[PDB]
Design an enzyme around this catalytic site. Structure first.
Site, PDB file in Angstrom:
ATOM      1  N   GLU A 101      -4.039  13.260   1.547  1.00 26.92           N
ATOM      2  CA  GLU A 101      -5.299  12.722   2.048  1.00 26.92           C
ATOM      3  C   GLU A 101      -6.147  13.862   2.586  1.00 26.92           C
ATOM      4  OE1 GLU A 101      -4.364   9.059   4.302  1.00 26.92           O
ATOM      5  OE2 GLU A 101      -5.025   8.219   2.380  1.00 26.92           O
TER       6      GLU A 101
ATOM      7  N   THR B 237      -6.921   5.860   7.758  1.00 26.45           N
ATOM      8  CA  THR B 237      -7.328   6.159   6.394  1.00 26.45           C
ATOM      9  C   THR B 237      -7.204   4.965   5.445  1.00 26.45           C
ATOM     10  OG1 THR B 237      -5.244   6.955   5.576  1.00 26.45           O
ATOM     11  CG2 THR B 237      -6.679   8.581   6.669  1.00 26.45           C
TER      12      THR B 237
ATOM     13  N   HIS C 258       4.830   6.728   7.315  1.00 24.72           N
ATOM     14  CA  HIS C 258       4.632   6.404   5.915  1.00 24.72           C
ATOM     15  C   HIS C 258       4.105   7.639   5.227  1.00 24.72           C
ATOM     16  CE1 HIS C 258       0.743   5.756   7.770  1.00 24.72           C
ATOM     17  NE2 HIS C 258       0.278   6.282   6.631  1.00 24.72           N
TER      18      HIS C 258
ATOM     19  N   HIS D  19       2.538  10.691   7.410  1.00 25.55           N
ATOM     20  CA  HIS D  19       1.840  10.294   8.607  1.00 25.55           C
ATOM     21  C   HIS D  19       2.819   9.649   9.578  1.00 25.55           C
ATOM     22  CE1 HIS D  19      -2.164  10.082   6.302  1.00 25.55           C
ATOM     23  NE2 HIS D  19      -1.835  11.327   6.655  1.00 25.55           N
TER      24      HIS D  19
ATOM     25  N   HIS E 249       0.844  -1.204   0.000  1.00 28.42           N
ATOM     26  CA  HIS E 249       0.000   0.000   0.000  1.00 28.42           C
ATOM     27  C   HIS E 249       0.884   1.261   0.000  1.00 28.42           C
ATOM     28  CE1 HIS E 249      -3.178  -2.836   0.439  1.00 28.42           C
ATOM     29  NE2 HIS E 249      -2.585  -3.359   1.499  1.00 28.42           N
TER      30      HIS E 249
ATOM     31  N   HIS F 288       1.528   9.082   1.727  1.00 25.30           N
ATOM     32  CA  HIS F 288       0.584   8.905   0.642  1.00 25.30           C
ATOM     33  C   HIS F 288       0.972   9.910  -0.426  1.00 25.30           C
ATOM     34  CE1 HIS F 288      -2.108   6.666   3.430  1.00 25.30           C
ATOM     35  NE2 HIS F 288      -1.537   7.425   4.327  1.00 25.30           N
TER      36      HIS F 288
HETATM   37  N1  LIG Z   1      -2.935   6.236   7.101  1.00 25.25           N
HETATM   38  S1  LIG Z   1      -3.067   6.230   8.689  1.00 25.25           S
HETATM   39  O1  LIG Z   1      -4.406   6.617   9.049  1.00 25.25           O
HETATM   40  O2  LIG Z   1      -1.955   6.970   9.272  1.00 25.25           O
HETATM   41  C1  LIG Z   1      -2.861   4.582   9.244  1.00 25.25           C
HETATM   42  C2  LIG Z   1      -3.596   3.562   8.672  1.00 25.25           C
HETATM   43  C3  LIG Z   1      -3.480   2.256   9.116  1.00 25.25           C
HETATM   44  C4  LIG Z   1      -2.602   1.946  10.135  1.00 25.25           C
HETATM   45  N2  LIG Z   1      -2.478   0.654  10.626  1.00 25.25           N
HETATM   46  C5  LIG Z   1      -3.087  -0.478  10.016  1.00 25.25           C
HETATM   47  C6  LIG Z   1      -3.156  -1.591  11.031  1.00 25.25           C
HETATM   48  C7  LIG Z   1      -4.230  -1.683  11.914  1.00 25.25           C
HETATM   49  C8  LIG Z   1      -4.227  -2.696  12.875  1.00 25.25           C
HETATM   50  C9  LIG Z   1      -3.114  -3.528  13.093  1.00 25.25           C
HETATM   51  B1  LIG Z   1      -3.079  -4.591  14.236  1.00 25.25           B
HETATM   52  O3  LIG Z   1      -1.868  -4.982  14.723  1.00 25.25           O
HETATM   53  O4  LIG Z   1      -4.214  -5.048  14.827  1.00 25.25           O
HETATM   54  C10 LIG Z   1      -2.004  -3.355  12.268  1.00 25.25           C
HETATM   55  C11 LIG Z   1      -2.018  -2.378  11.288  1.00 25.25           C
HETATM   56  C12 LIG Z   1      -1.853   2.966  10.707  1.00 25.25           C
HETATM   57  C13 LIG Z   1      -2.000   4.253  10.272  1.00 25.25           C
HETATM   58 ZN   LIG Z   2      -1.450   7.238   6.337  1.00 22.06          ZN
END
Ligand SMILES: NS(=O)(=O)c1ccc(NCc2ccc(B(O)O)cc2)cc1
Ligand SMILES: [Zn+2]
Ligand SMILES: NS(=O)(=O)c1ccc(NCc2ccc(B(O)O)cc2)cc1
Length: 257
Positions: free
Chosen positions: A103, A195, A91, A116, A61, A93
């Protein structure tokens, strides 16, 4: 199978992740004139001097620069927050073109990219528990515009050829995330979500007003990454952003007048 194509992109995500249509989804457009100055908001406290970066990963992603989050080495405090939040990863986008990629938007303006810096509230013990909570994460969002190069980004750019495809990782020790910040820490804040799937409503968003500048060449290198795995058809990793979502029953708060 979610992603950013026509057939699996953001308008499809609700079918597997129904919270996509929830009450506090991210990102949002930030209307600068209707954001409310909030004198209760505190200055951010960004404490990254003891950060320990470990690895960089192409997850299919984006790419994540991962940190050691087993101690308070790199933490965010203050601002709207009432706890200590450990940095786990950052990371970006970004777009296929410089006119898109962020975003969040500002008065409907897209930036070329958005950084982010993802942090979790230490009282929940692990990231996986934190994402289950309404105050589990704090994500520090920073816009990227194209102009002069960002010196502190170049170490990231130069490793990308070693993580071209999904599931590749590389060493990424001794990277200082302080080199990705703008001068000012003025910010907007609101309650939102991840997101990307699972789109959990666990994030206090802190979006910095001042963008950073990166060079055209730096963002061109982001666009050479692949969504696909090695040995699969090449799909460039571009346009990995979710568009702005309905604001619903939220008003964005400003730290500054
Ligand atoms: N794009 S963002 O909103 O910053 C963002 C989006 C997604 C994620 N994490 C995605 C994610 C969610 C849960 C788990 B787990 O260990 O249960 C691992 C990874 C982190 C930040
Ligand atoms: Zn992000
Ligand atoms: N977005 S989602 O609801 O999770 C979801 C969307 C689509 C699918 N399957 C269909 C699908 C999956 C991937 C691609 B592609 O271009 O790489 C196209 C079609 C599976 C789940």
């Amino acid at each position: 199978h979610w992603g950013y194509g026509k057939h699996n992109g953001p308008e499809h995500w609700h079918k597997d992740f129904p919270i996509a249509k929830g009450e506090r989804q991210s990102p949002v457009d930030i209307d600068t004139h209707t954001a409310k100055y909030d004198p209760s908001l505190k200055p951010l406290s960004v404490s990254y001097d003891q950060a320990t970066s470990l690895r960089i990963l192409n997850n299919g992603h984006a790419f994540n620069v991962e940190f050691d989050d087993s101690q308070d080495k790199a933490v965010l405090k203050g601002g709207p927050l009432d706890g200590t939040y450990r940095l786990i990863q950052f990371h970006f986008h970004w777009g296929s073109l410089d006119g898109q990629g962020s975003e969040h938007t500002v008065d409907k303006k897209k930036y070329a990219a958005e950084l982010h810096l993802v942090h979790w509230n230490t009282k929940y013990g692990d990231f996986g528990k934190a994402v289950q909570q309404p105050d589990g994460l704090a994500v520090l969002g920073i816009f990227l515009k194209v102009g002069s190069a960002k010196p502190g980004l170049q170490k990231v750019v130069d490793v990308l050829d070693s993580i071209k495809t999904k599931g590749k990782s590389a060493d990424f020790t001794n990277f200082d995330p302080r080199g990705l910040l703008p001068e000012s820490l003025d910010y907007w804040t609101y309650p939102g979500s991840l997101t990307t799937p699972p789109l959990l409503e666990c994030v206090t968003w802190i979006v910095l007003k001042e963008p950073i500048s990166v060079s055209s060449e730096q963002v061109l290198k982001f666009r050479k990454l692949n969504f696909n795995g090695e040995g699969e058809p090449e799909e460039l990793m571009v346009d990995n952003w979710r568009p702005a979502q309905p604001l619903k029953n939220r008003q964005i708060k400003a730290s500054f007048k």
